[PDB]
A paper describes a structure:
Furthermore, our co-crystal structures showed that the Tyr33 side chain of β‘WD40 pushes away the Tyr1272 side chain of the S heptapeptide. This Tyr33 is replaced by a smaller His31 residue in the αWD40 domain. We hypothesized that the replacement of the bulky Tyr33 side chain with a smaller residue would allow Tyr1272 to move closer to the β‘WD40 surface, thereby further strengthening the binding between S and β‘WD40. Therefore, we generated a β‘WD40 Tyr33Ala mutant and determined its co-crystal structure with the clientized S heptapeptide at a resolution of 1.8 Å. Although the S Tyr1272 side chain was indeed closer to the mutant β‘WD40 surface by 0.8 Å, overall, the Tyr1272 side chain was still >4 Å away from the β‘WD40 surface. A BLI assay revealed this was insufficient to enhance S-β‘WD40 affinity. Moreover, this β‘WD40 Tyr33Ala mutation abolished binding to the clientized Thr1273Glu S heptapeptide, suggesting a previously unrecognized role for β‘WD40 Tyr33 in S heptapeptide binding. Moreover, β‘WD40 Tyr33 plays a critical role in stabilizing S tail binding through interactions with the tail Tyr1272 side-chain.
Author numbering: 0 to 301
Write the structure that this text describes.
């Protein structure tokens, strides 16, 4: 049971949206496309702030680094690129991995970036040390699809891997603090942390149609969420509302009750397969945004 008030704020068509991110203080959403293009939209005015043809290959990963006025993106050409979004200047451009970059995470306070790659590793970059490669995390046995800092202890992070595991690491140590054997036999596409201090929870999404909730102190599966009818691309906890949001190649977003783990609403936004998700970091208007085959949509909830 739950009362939801979902409003479409802004939706627009584009090539396939593989990455998406909210700016914390400007009403902006970043989209990164399979076409090599990235776009920054003001979703309140519905005007493009800035766009870049970054490369000719897909750009699967993109994040704002607001405290530097940067966007950072990673692409199938193996390269990490950083742009100032006020001038368009390309700040840095380097080969990060010898294979596809699937995911990028930005430390909340330190000048650290994590990149997850088909080269089976996560790499740690320090932009206050000339973008030095500070550490490579080895252990996974297939593509690393998703990396995410623990917002409550960002000296640790999680990596989700097609080898069917999540690994949780400590910066400066070479082996996982623990490995979760998820039982998601088609691999792990996405991993996310519950942001609030009251629960030590993470969540994983898989091609095997399931979503799983984990207690990372007991390493136990709290619940399994079933309902999607094709590959689940992502699942995340909402930063303010008691819900989980997932999206799937079945073309839907699903909103789940985070206490009962039952589905509360299924949305078909009409843009075919769903690939990526973002939630506004301060919970402004409970905004969420998802990228799809045929564009993106920004929704306000509650």
């Amino acid at each position: 049971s739950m009362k939801l008030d979902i409003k479409k704020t802004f939706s627009n068509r584009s090539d396939r949206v593989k990455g998406i991110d909210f700016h914390p203080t400007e009403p902006w959403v970043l989209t990164t496309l399979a076409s090599g293009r990235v776009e920054i939209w003001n979703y309140e005015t519905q005007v493009e702030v800035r766009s870049i043809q970054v490369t000719e290959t897909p750009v699967r990963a993109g994040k704002f680094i607001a405290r530097k006025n940067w966007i950072i993106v990673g692409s199938d050409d193996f390269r990490i690129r950083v742009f100032n979004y006020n001038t368009g200047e390309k700040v840095v451009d380097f080969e990060a991995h010898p294979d596809y970059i699937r995911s990028i995470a930005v430390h909340p306070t330190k000048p650290y970036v994590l990149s997850g790659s088909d080269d089976l590793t996560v790499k740690l970059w320090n932009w206050e040390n000339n973008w030095a490669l500070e550490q490579t995390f080895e252990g996974h046995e297939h593509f690393v699809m998703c990396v995410a800092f623990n917002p409550k202890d960002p000296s640790t992070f999680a990596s989700g891997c097609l080898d069917r595991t999540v690994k949780v690491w400590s910066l400066g140590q070479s082996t996982p603090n623990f490995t979760l054997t998820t039982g998601q036999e088609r691999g792990v596409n996405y991993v996310d942390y519950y942001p609030l201090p009251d629960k030590p929870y993470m969540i994983t999404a898989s091609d095997d149609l399931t979503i799983k909730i984990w207690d990372y102190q007991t390493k136990s599966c709290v619940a399994t969420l079933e309902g999607h009818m094709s590959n689940v691309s992502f699942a995340v906890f909402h930063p303010t509302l008691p819900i989980i949001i997932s999206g799937s190649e079945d073309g839907t977003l699903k909103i789940w009750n985070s206490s009962t783990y039952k589905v509360e609403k299924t949305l078909n936004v009409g843009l075919e397969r769903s690939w990526c998700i973002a939630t506004h970091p301060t919970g402004r208007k409970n905004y969420i945004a998802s990228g799809f085959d045929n564009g993106f949509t920004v929704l306000s909830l509650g």
